Assembly symmetry: C4
Homo-oligomer: 118 residues x 4
């Protein structure tokens, strides 16, 4: 029998229950988005809390982050996405950073995972 820790144990959605992610395993999730013709993007924010309202169902605060430059339309190689992450983290070394993708035919995001923590 073992006990799960309730104090100071935050989580960050998908892939947060596995061992930490290495640099190889990161450029295998981008070649899967490129093989299906999706569009990469980047974001950053200094905090991650959630706020509500008294009597309004389905309203939450803290779901929008700030966009780095613009979506990378017409991209074929995975060596540019990896270089943009390094430019992002040299200017803001005290924020979180997250990677997304875009399906343009169904208009919905397809991926999300964290690559940097403060």
């Amino acid at each position: 029998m073992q006990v799960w820790n309730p104090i100071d144990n935050p989580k960050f959605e998908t892939l947060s229950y596995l061992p930490p992610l290495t640099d190889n395993q990161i450029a295998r999730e981008i070649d899967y988005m490129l093989r299906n013709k999706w569009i990469p993007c980047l974001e950053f924010d200094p905090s991650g809390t959630i706020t509500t309202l008294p009597g309004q169902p389905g309203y939450y605060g803290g779901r929008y982050w700030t966009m780095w430059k613009l979506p990378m339309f017409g991209c074929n190689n995975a060596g540019y996405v990896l270089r943009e992450i390094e430019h992002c983290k040299n200017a803001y070394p005290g924020c979180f950073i997250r990677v997304l993708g875009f399906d343009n035919i169904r208009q919905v995001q397809c991926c999300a995972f964290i690559v940097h923590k403060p």
Copy 2:
């Protein structure tokens, strides 16, 4: 004439107005729960405050604590409950700890008292 102190004087429900509890007087409240065929349990939480809501009668926040492992079904000797409290005290030396009992025929708790303070 004497004056009761209003500053920094919290209380913790049953048995809090008596002198502090010794190790002998603790293993006399367990032999009374065992003589009536009840089931022991343990809990712990870092805080103890209470919160309310504007216009909802009978709603309070801060009434659930975290359970240690599981209720001790089929227990006859009082030397195991005393050993589990010591295992609980080494993992979390900065929390409160409470002892409970269960009546399975009327479905209601039967006792509660505090054994450790931060």
Copy 3:
């Protein structure tokens, strides 16, 4: 022309716009309450702020203080009220203190002023 200061300038109701009160001028407001057959009392509290509620007219929080021992029924000399203030000042040297009076025929207070500040 001169300017009235808006920063860090609290006030405490009646008699608070006059120069500070000396020990002589304090035992002249008690002989005026005793000449009309009223009953002295004492109070103390650590804070002095006021709160409200969203949509309830005439509700304010922070209007009750704590009472020292009991009202002084049947008191004729002013040397006891002055001695009780000194007993109150040694037990709680970090609170405010107020002096009250009671009219028992119209059931309403008649006086109030501050004698000690933290």
Copy 4:
């Protein structure tokens, strides 16, 4: 491509997106108010934040400041407005300061800009 900074970048309404203001171009915005027959005034406050209410459209908190002495009725030279700003700066060296103007025929303010920051 360049990125606009989202962290710790407050703004103060009109003329805040231009380079900082020198002493020459502070005595050119007053001769424009004097040529149209308007009335100068001054203000100061220690903070600059805004607050709202749950369900009341068009209500905001933090829109009133404190007035220095009085509006300058019948003023023709711009050397008095410049001297009053210096008297205001020695008494309260930890507040913001604003300059206003008044049109008495349409009853509406005509300008506002900041001249001192903490």
